């Protein structure tokens with residue numbers, strides 16, 4: 001069938017019936033259907049008017065010399081006749097989601113947690129051909145057969161956000177492979193693999209996997225703002241950066257201590273916390289500077305890393 | 319004739335009759351036909367409407383300033399009148415096939431087998447001009463007349479997949495020429511030789527022609543995956559890469575031997591084969607590891623080369639050879655036959671040492687675990703004092719992963735502080751020994767977890783290392 005490709009377990013179908021849609025890079029079948037009953041057609045209206053489409057030869061790409069439109073054998077017409085509408089190929093969206101959920105595309109993921117990944121996408125060309133997935137190692141070799149987990153290479157239309165194998169999408173168990181940069185390639189099953197019909201999504205595998213913290217500088221004076229970055233963390237989850245109140249200057253006040261952490265970067269909330277109660281940056285309602293014991297700044301992460309900042313002013317020289 | 323060019327043995331025809339098709343780069347003939355009876359025409363509908371086409375002058379290329387469409391002398395019209403439809407030139411597909419069949423374009427071919435090659439193509443402009451073939455040497459000279467074999471230069475429409483001279487296509491006997499890179503150029507007979515109407519197909523001639531095998535590295539340790547490439551082979555045929563079972567480690571199991579070859583690259587099937595029977599990777603039905611004698615991995619080739627991979631883990635520390643076999647041989651029947659070619663690599667052992675837990679340790683203090691492991695995945699820490707090596711319960715999974723730099727580290731851990739009977743030994747003041755061991759234990763056979771107290775023989779048998787440590791009171 002065409003339009004319902006999986007009803008017959010066929011990877012591709014190239015028999016076109018009157019009224020359907022045809023894409024730019026297709027290779028119509030001349031054996032049966034509208035490939036031998038009407039080989040050549042002409043434009044009907046608009047820019048397409050007057051131009052000639054030959055079904056037997058591969059339809060040209062580039063959308064130049066073959067303007068998009070509707071084609072009718074007779075010429076400009078409105079009566080029922082063998083006609084077809086040319087449309088461009090496209091894949092609107094693609095993503096790699098962890099089993100829990102959340103995108104990790106273009107970002108390094110721990111080897112331990114990279115064991116139940118999923119790939120989902122939305123594409124325009126579902127009536128003609130499904131879209132293939134090909135995982136490539138940093139060396140440049142097809143590793144699809146090694147990481148596949150019980151599902152055929154074909155991914156269905158829609159099914160974006162599907163965290164389960166029941167919905168369309170392919171499951172990859174990337175735990176066994178070593179550290180490196182891997183590229184997932186999506187392209188049409190047979191012919192629709194040219195520009196705008198293919199996408200290369202990167203993914204980084206690494207095993208240094210403790211939640212990491214780095215500073216642009218280590219030796220600084222008071223008052224110099226320092227930006228700190230958290231690395232190798234789960235996306236969509238909130239970490240906590242702490243500050244020992246012993247390091248604060250003795251002569252600080254309550255309002256003077258709530259400005260140690262800035263709201264810079266991905267930080268959501270800042271404040272000081274006692275063992276049982278907290279005093280956030282919104283209001284001076286919780287514990288006081290002497291009453292509280294820790295200073296915190298809850299920080300999210302977007303991607304593989306998040307950035308915050310500190311103010312070395314009012315800090316002891318140690 | 320036009321449309322049936324070979325009915326009159328004419329290479330080209332430039333007399334246009336009413337109703338036909340004309341291409342972009344043509345040069346209409348003004349002597350007769352619709353070249354003197356109606357020299358200029360105008361657009362009829364669409365983008366072409368209003369534009370003027372002059373047949374006498376060469377039709378412009380670039381599809382700009384001369385929009386594609388139908389042209390009529392009167393103007394916009396639907397009545398029968400001298401009219402013509404402009405179309406772009408194109409050649410949809412081209413290939414070079416061996417006499418047996420199979421593409422070899424863009425890939426090196428043996429000089430011996432390059433004696434019955436064929437060139438076939440599919441092009442859009444068949445009514446006006448045929449398409450020429452011109453073979454060029456690496457020096458840049460037309461060698462078409464030397465390699466031609468009994469057929470005119472003109473190749474017909476269709477005839478793609480034609481392995482015989484009866485069908486359209488040109489036969490080339492490229493056996494006599496020397497080694498080099500040759501370019502086959504296809505272009506229209508007279509005028510249609512510009513962009514999109516011409517194609518340059520490369521082809522490499524070489525005489526180093528034994529089936530070749532290469533490795534990205536020769537000196538490696540255990541566990542390091544190695545990618546091997548097969549070179550200079552017939553496309554579309556399945557070779558066989560073999561493995562001598564003598565080189566395998568003695569302590570391997572049946573399931574442990576079926577993972578020596580990966581399914582990476584062009585490999586189709588992997589498995590182990592006895593002289594008469596085979597045990598494929600699909601199921602453990604055929605011979606066992608002791609019963610079987612060879613390990614194979616049937617590999618195809620796409621182009622001139624194919625890539626596979628091996629896993630040096632569970633391999634003896636010695637010279638390792640790779641044997642290839644001729645195309646079409648069966649796995650079972652290849653046990654006795656000599657290998658067409660071979661390649662050898664050397665494998666050496668790797669070291670795994672500790673750095674930070676050495677010399678002194680204050681009892682109850684916390685310290686990080688710092689060290690290196692060249693060929694390791696999971697490592698465990700054991701403590702010995704005048705007897706057994708008691709396992710040290712580091713915590714999560716009792717293992718540490720190793721980075722690419724062959725180095726492993728752990729956060730600050732109090733050895734005596736942690737709960738367990740292992741720490742109780744370190745609680746008391748004295749001199750002890752501490753060592754690291756790879757995941758080869760794996761509960762000395764069983765569940766995938768390091769939970770035992772390996773003795774001296776068990777600890778020493780596997781890859782490991784120990785250093786003297788003493789604990790000082792606070």
Ligand SMILES: *[C@@H]1O[C@H](CO)[C@@H](O)[C@H](O)[C@H]1O
Nearest residue numbers: 001002010012013014015
């Ligand atoms: C394409 O679809 C048509 C219509 O069902 C079918 O007849 C062909 O066999 C298939 O390839």
Ligand SMILES: *[C@@H]1O[C@H](CO)[C@@H](O)[C@H](O)[C@H]1O
Nearest residue numbers: 319320328330331332333
């Ligand atoms: C082109 O074709 C016409 C029509 O048969 C013929 O008259 C000319 O001699 C040839 O060149």
